[PDB]
Design an enzyme around this catalytic site. Structure first.
Site, short mmCIF file in Angstrom:
data_model
loop_
_atom_site.label_atom_id
_atom_site.label_comp_id
_atom_site.label_asym_id
_atom_site.label_seq_id
_atom_site.Cartn_x
_atom_site.Cartn_y
_atom_site.Cartn_z
N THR A 83 3.80 18.56 0.74
CA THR A 83 3.21 19.88 0.55
C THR A 83 2.92 20.56 1.88
O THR A 83 2.48 19.92 2.84
CB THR A 83 1.91 19.83 -0.28
OG1 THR A 83 1.44 21.17 -0.48
CG2 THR A 83 0.84 19.04 0.44
N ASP A 105 -3.46 9.95 9.25
CA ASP A 105 -2.06 10.36 9.27
C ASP A 105 -1.63 10.85 10.65
O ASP A 105 -1.88 11.99 11.00
CB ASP A 105 -1.81 11.48 8.26
CG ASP A 105 -0.33 11.82 8.14
OD1 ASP A 105 0.48 10.89 8.00
OD2 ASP A 105 0.01 13.02 8.19
N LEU A 138 0.81 -1.21 0.00
CA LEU A 138 0.00 0.00 0.00
C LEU A 138 0.85 1.26 0.00
O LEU A 138 0.38 2.34 -0.36
CB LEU A 138 -0.93 0.01 1.21
CG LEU A 138 -1.90 -1.17 1.30
CD1 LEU A 138 -2.68 -1.12 2.60
CD2 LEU A 138 -2.84 -1.18 0.10
N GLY A 139 2.10 1.13 0.41
CA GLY A 139 2.99 2.28 0.45
C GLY A 139 4.38 1.88 0.84
O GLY A 139 4.60 0.83 1.45
N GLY A 188 11.14 5.89 3.19
CA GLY A 188 12.37 5.76 3.94
C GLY A 188 12.21 5.09 5.29
O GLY A 188 13.04 4.27 5.68
N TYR A 189 11.15 5.44 6.02
CA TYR A 189 10.89 4.87 7.34
C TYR A 189 10.47 3.40 7.28
O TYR A 189 10.65 2.64 8.23
CB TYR A 189 9.80 5.67 8.06
CG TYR A 189 10.27 6.90 8.79
CD1 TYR A 189 11.44 6.90 9.53
CD2 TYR A 189 9.52 8.07 8.75
CE1 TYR A 189 11.85 8.05 10.21
CE2 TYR A 189 9.92 9.21 9.42
CZ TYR A 189 11.08 9.20 10.15
OH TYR A 189 11.47 10.34 10.81
N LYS A 236 7.36 0.59 5.28
CA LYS A 236 6.50 0.05 4.24
C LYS A 236 5.13 -0.32 4.80
O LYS A 236 5.03 -0.73 5.96
CB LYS A 236 7.19 -1.16 3.62
CG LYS A 236 6.58 -1.72 2.34
CD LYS A 236 7.62 -2.64 1.68
CE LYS A 236 7.11 -3.27 0.40
NZ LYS A 236 8.13 -4.19 -0.19
O1 LIG Z 1 1.18 4.86 5.79
C1 LIG Z 1 0.98 5.15 4.61
N1 LIG Z 1 2.04 5.34 3.69
C2 LIG Z 1 3.45 5.22 3.95
C3 LIG Z 1 4.37 5.61 2.97
C4 LIG Z 1 5.73 5.50 3.19
C5 LIG Z 1 6.21 4.99 4.38
C6 LIG Z 1 5.30 4.60 5.34
C7 LIG Z 1 5.79 4.04 6.64
F1 LIG Z 1 7.11 4.12 6.85
F2 LIG Z 1 5.22 4.61 7.71
F3 LIG Z 1 5.51 2.73 6.77
C8 LIG Z 1 3.94 4.71 5.15
C9 LIG Z 1 -0.43 5.32 4.11
C10 LIG Z 1 -1.47 5.34 5.22
C11 LIG Z 1 -2.89 5.26 4.74
N2 LIG Z 1 -3.11 4.05 4.00
C12 LIG Z 1 -4.01 3.05 4.33
N3 LIG Z 1 -4.49 2.27 3.32
C13 LIG Z 1 -5.37 1.29 3.63
N4 LIG Z 1 -5.85 0.95 4.84
C14 LIG Z 1 -5.36 1.74 5.83
N5 LIG Z 1 -5.64 1.66 7.18
C15 LIG Z 1 -4.90 2.68 7.79
N6 LIG Z 1 -4.16 3.38 6.91
C16 LIG Z 1 -4.44 2.80 5.66
C17 LIG Z 1 -2.26 3.89 2.82
C18 LIG Z 1 -0.77 4.22 3.04
#
Ligand SMILES: O=C(Nc1cccc(C(F)(F)F)c1)C1CCN(c2ncnc3[nH]cnc23)CC1
Ligand SMILES: [Zn+2]
Length: 289
Positions: free
Chosen positions: A171, A154, A15-16, A19-20, A22
């Site tokens: 942003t 977030d 889903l994403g 750097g920190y 995944k």
């Molecule tokens: O955390 C995210 N992206 C991201 C990007 C880069 C790095 C990192 C990290 F290092 F923290 F792991 C995280 C997003 C959060 C919201 N998302 C969710 N998608 C689906 N179910 C969900 N339930 C709760 N949130 C979501 C989609 C992705």
């Protein structure tokens, strides 16, 4: 007692990534909730120590978040640390980002904007009561569940992929002047950001945009609000009460907090009890679209 391990979850898709760490969509394959689908964030503790502002802060935020029960705030279900990694298990949200809806629609009808902003205001009211400031209501930071209702998602560490201290990563167009100036701030920044999001919903872009980062900041600080002649009197009045440089004087900044915003004529048609109970039909239903 159930021993939670990373092996309790099978990976379904990514889903994403940043750097920190995944984020995965996962299925729990053992224990009570066998078969249930979750979102799993996997953070590299080694990276957290390096890139940081105040781990105690972000930790406290997640500590509170884990206990929060609210229909318009994401459920942080389990959190555990094994290996050199931090695992956060959250409810899975299939409705996508509010950003995606805006991209599709171009701009929202006022009734559409009103629905989302109303649900967001209740999430913000609850967060402030529990001691959390959301900071940044850019539409990518608001997800939809399968029904089309808002989930604020977030929290904690900076999730951006391209970094920059983490205030200027990603942003800054929806963040209050006093955050950018690092001059000190409180929950009033959230009502600013709600205004910036509202402005984007209704006009197609956030209120203060520049050709580059420097010019954008300068415009945010100057806060010379341009009110479009084609929006209703109620929308313009709410926008001018939210997007104010004087944080203390923003609607919502006083002791009534979200109650001040929720009383505004822009929200006159909202039944707050029905909204909270998710008995109001969302403008968009992800499962049907
Ligand atoms: O955390 C995210 N992206 C991201 C990007 C880069 C790095 C990192 C990290 F290092 F923290 F792991 C995280 C997003 C959060 C919201 N998302 C969710 N998608 C689906 N179910 C969900 N339930 C709760 N949130 C979501 C989609 C992705
Ligand atoms: Zn960052």
């Amino acid at each position: 007692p159930e021993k939670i391990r990373p092996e309790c979850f099978e990976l379904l898709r990514v889903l994403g990534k940043g750097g920190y760490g995944k984020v995965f969509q996962v299925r729990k394959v053992t224990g009570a909730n066998t078969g249930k689908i979750f979102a799993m964030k996997v953070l590299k503790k080694a990276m957290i120590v390096r890139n940081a502002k105040d781990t105690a802060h972000t930790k406290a935020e997640r500590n509170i978040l884990e206990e929060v029960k609210h229909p318009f705030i994401v459920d942080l279900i389990y959190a555990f640390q094994t290996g050199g990694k931090l695992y956060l298990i959250l409810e899975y949200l299939s409705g996508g980002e509010l950003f995606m809806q805006l991209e599709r629609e171009g701009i929202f009808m006022e009734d559409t904007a009103c629905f989302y902003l109303a649900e967001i205001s209740m999430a913000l009211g609850h967060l402030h009561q529990k001691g959390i400031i959301y900071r940044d209501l850019k539409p990518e930071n608001i997800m939809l569940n399968h029904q089309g209702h808002v989930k604020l998602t977030d929290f904690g560490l900076c999730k951006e992929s391209i970094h920059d201290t983490h205030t200027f990563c990603g942003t800054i167009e929806y963040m209050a002047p006093e955050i950018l100036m690092r001059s000190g701030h409180n929950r009033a920044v959230d009502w600013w950001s709600l205004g910036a999001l509202m402005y984007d919903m209704l006009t197609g872009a956030p209120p203060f945009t520049g050709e580059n980062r420097k010019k954008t900041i300068d415009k945010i600080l100057k806060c010379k609000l341009n009110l479009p002649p084609y929006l209703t009197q109620e929308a313009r009045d709410l926008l001018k009460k939210l997007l104010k440089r004087n944080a203390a004087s923003r609607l919502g900044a006083g002791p009534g907090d979200a109650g001040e915003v929720q009383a505004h004529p822009f929200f006159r048609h909202i039944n707050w009890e029905e909204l909270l109970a998710r008995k109001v039909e969302p403008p968009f239903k992800p499962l049907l679209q």
